Design a protein around this ligand. Structure first.
Ligand SMILES: NC(=O)C1=CN([C@@H]2O[C@H](COP(=O)(O)OP(=O)(O)OC[C@H]3O[C@@H](n4cnc5c(N)ncnc54)[C@H](OP(=O)(O)O)[C@@H]3O)[C@@H](O)[C@H]2O)C=CC1
Ligand SMILES: NC(=O)C1=CN([C@@H]2O[C@H](COP(=O)(O)OP(=O)(O)OC[C@H]3O[C@@H](n4cnc5c(N)ncnc54)[C@H](OP(=O)(O)O)[C@@H]3O)[C@@H](O)[C@H]2O)C=CC1
Ligand SMILES: NC(=O)C1=CN([C@@H]2O[C@H](COP(=O)(O)OP(=O)(O)OC[C@H]3O[C@@H](n4cnc5c(N)ncnc54)[C@H](OP(=O)(O)O)[C@@H]3O)[C@@H](O)[C@H]2O)C=CC1
Ligand SMILES: NC(=O)C1=CN([C@@H]2O[C@H](COP(=O)(O)OP(=O)(O)OC[C@H]3O[C@@H](n4cnc5c(N)ncnc54)[C@H](OP(=O)(O)O)[C@@H]3O)[C@@H](O)[C@H]2O)C=CC1
Lengths: 219, 219, 219, 219
């Protein structure tokens, strides 16, 4: 029978691109997010979601690109916690309730981001979330073995994550990046998708965080 | 003009030992926690606390030793969020409202723990919290400069943190650790206190995480 | 028109498997090592090797699986230095003289190994070599941009690397690993080759070290 | 029965400052370098040296500040290997022959430097050396237990290490760093020496790398 994928966050950006690349005659690709009725921050919603999916092979979580920007002294802690509730706690909830459905040879692939390790002013919420994701990924890899668990850590990537910026501001952001990254380009969703596919396919990889950040971490 | 310290969590274990060591004729040492009326997880309570203290030199946070032990698939997420609310968000709140009172030459020293980087089954809450603390320590060091910000990362230390274990259990934990660690002993509070004093004293250290873990990280 | 690859160490184990996977109607794959007349430890030999190849697209270095095992206090430093001359200095020399031949879109992929970061008694030579490779990889990524530079860090993989072992001891080594790694198998060369293909393919990745170690780093 | 220190590299800069601070009525401090007849890169010289000293308590190695600056593609590999021979292999040799003379409760403290982990163009030799030192430090901590083994990782410090610079360019270097660093100053030898004293003093620390870099790693 077909290999079955669940992509929480697969309705937009990196997750949607991955889901697109995963579709074939030999696969079933489920995507879900708030717009499909799933709130990954909500434990009951996640629990009942997997109940309806049943046994599957690979879980990928890309949900939750929002975080309040700003200095620690200025950021509203309520908004920071909200951000944590989706990206961090949502991944925890997805693993907690999804793992029991994973078939032999399956895996979980979470998402962090280079701010876990690139120290940048005004980014503590993103950095803390990503650091937590990477640590939890490794604990999960140990606890769920032989189910494999890894994380992809993207650098700046052109997606809907930035649909709320003024378009000119967005372009200037992309251009600054292009101009200062060693690779001399901004990431495309398909560049990041490739890394999830690699984690999914490699039966000798678990507890790993794969950076795809155009050299951003090199400072 | 005495040097003024604030130790949030200074009423027990590691904080208490440090507070004791900071006491002198040329210092004033404030300690606080729930038993003195400070709930570090409550923003208005933290704000009130620093209003009562006024200008001071060094802030140290050791508060929040609790975390629900167990596998990701077994741990109660409400309890996990509770732990985060004290140790992680408490540290965030303490920096956020304490920073403006720090005098020239001042510092903030937070507390993580070797589980940020030592991967151990059944410890995701502690590991995630400590990873978040370490990432946030570094962002703070960048944002609050020239105020210095560092973190102490302890290994197993004999304190009231374990007061709620089956006494048979705790002794077994202590003996097994003493048996397996390169240094052949469990940590004493004074060993860890020494590290805060070092962070406080060193005008050339910021953004650093100091491990005092008896070699546990070496596996 | 065709994409040209150079694999130094491509005559055995991981390098040979990679070279086999790179072969196609669209590519030209060159492999080299001592048995083909290239000693990667010898600067003149390396310099003259690249003259004979001319312009190419991707350099991969897997050469040098040997290192004297044993405690720091016991290991013959002369033999330790010999191991460095091939695997570490070899990589340096290949980058130093090969870089100027790399076409637009090109990349260098080096090889380290999990012992860079998994602390194991009796392995200081392998650990130090791998640590040096990973650091040099990142410096190279910055210096050679937009040429991309990454490293693959393998865990235990069944190859000719262990041809010097008694066959029974080797089977037992493999089995102890299979029995204890989270993924419950020993690495095959094709599992590691997959990672080099990924690094070659991803135009948004540079300065990255990719672990494919079956979970060994999780301890 | 006084406590005996050996500081290889103790005739200049950081090592000399530490030697000065170690002097006491209850200590004996030995310093040594080429100018005293110890060439730490030469195994028989190192062996001879420890025969002359006999049983002692704490070994500190600061020897070998030199390295050829420049890009991988430009640096003379002979000079690069010379740098490794002193700072890296010298530390290896010192531990190898010094370890057997270490009294109960003793320790080894080595020196790396922030470039192990801060990626900077034109620094591969220093970066690789320091990465190798940090990895070897941890292996030694495991192998020599209960002897404790740690390393200090300095950032820019005002010492004789920069004597060979055009006194104009050296001032440019100091001033530029003072203005870029979070702590707003260049390191003084005493700042770094403090960290060795802390490693020597702490019976619960081993396998640890202590950064004292004024925030350089924060980027
Ligand atoms: N693009 C970049 O520059 C970077 C990307 N990333 C990380 O990669 C991941 C994906 O990023 P990206 O594809 O660009 O983001 P997008 O904004 O394009 O997509 C975000 C997705 O998350 C879903 N989502 C948000 N909240 C919830 C929720 N409460 N429950 C269920 N689904 C939710 C969204 O759908 P819906 O609104 O319907 O819920 C959407 O499908 C994120 O973790 C992001 O932080 C990391 C670093 C850099
Ligand atoms: N001991 C060990 O083996 C390890 C220690 N640590 C870490 O070191 C730090 C201190 O540990 P330790 O000294 O052993 O802990 P203790 O359990 O001895 O002390 C904890 C302190 O935190 C205070 N506290 C708890 N909750 C709050 C709150 N909501 N608001 C204000 N204060 C609070 C407590 O006082 P009160 O109840 O009155 O609020 C108490 O003063 C912790 O971060 C811990 O995780 C890290 C790794 C290993
Ligand atoms: N297999 C494993 O378990 C592990 C593998 N690795 C690393 O991966 C890399 C490759 O491993 P593996 O494929 O298994 O090793 P193999 O021993 O199968 O192959 C090693 C290759 O290096 C070549 N070589 C050795 N010395 C020189 C030299 N002086 N000049 C040119 N070529 C040389 C060999 O060919 P020739 O004899 O003709 O020179 C051979 O092609 C190594 O860096 C190794 O340390 C890392 C960790 C785990
Ligand atoms: N100052 C800085 O900005 C930084 C310092 N450091 C590191 O700290 C350590 C010390 O630095 P620093 O004190 O400034 O350097 P110094 O140049 O002041 O001192 C170097 C010492 O090493 C000795 N030495 C050199 N070669 C040998 C040898 N072959 N055998 C025995 N001894 C030798 C020298 O004496 P002699 O000539 O008699 O041999 C001298 O005592 C080094 O590892 C350095 O890399 C790390 C990062 C930044």
């Amino acid at each position: 029978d077909k290999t079955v994928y669940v992509v929480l966050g697969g309705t937009s950006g990196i997750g949607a691109e991955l889901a697109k690349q995963l579709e074939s005659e030999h696969t079933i690709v489920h995507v879900a997010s708030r717009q499909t009725g799933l709130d990954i921050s909500d434990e009951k919603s996640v629990y009942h979601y997997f109940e309806t999916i049943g046994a599957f092979d690979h879980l990928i979580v890309t949900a939750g690109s929002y975080a309040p920007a700003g200095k620690v002294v200025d950021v509203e802690v309520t908004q920071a916690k909200y951000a944590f509730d989706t990206k961090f706690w949502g991944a925890v909830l997805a693993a907690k309730h999804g793992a029991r459905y994973l078939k032999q040879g399956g895996s979980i692939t979470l998402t962090s981001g280079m701010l876990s390790r690139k120290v940048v002013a005004n980014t503590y919420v993103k950095a803390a979330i990503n650091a937590a994701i990477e640590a939890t990924t490794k604990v999960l890899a140990k606890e769920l073995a032989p189910i494999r668990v890894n994380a992809i850590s993207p650098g700046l990537t052109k997606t809907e994550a930035y649909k709320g910026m003024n378009a000119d501001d967005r372009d200037a952001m992309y251009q600054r990046t292009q101009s200062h990254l060693p690779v001399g380009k901004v990431g495309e969703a398909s560049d990041i998708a490739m890394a999830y596919l690699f984690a999914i396919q490699n039966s000798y990889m678990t507890g790993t965080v794969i950076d795809v950040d155009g050299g951003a971490l090199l400072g």
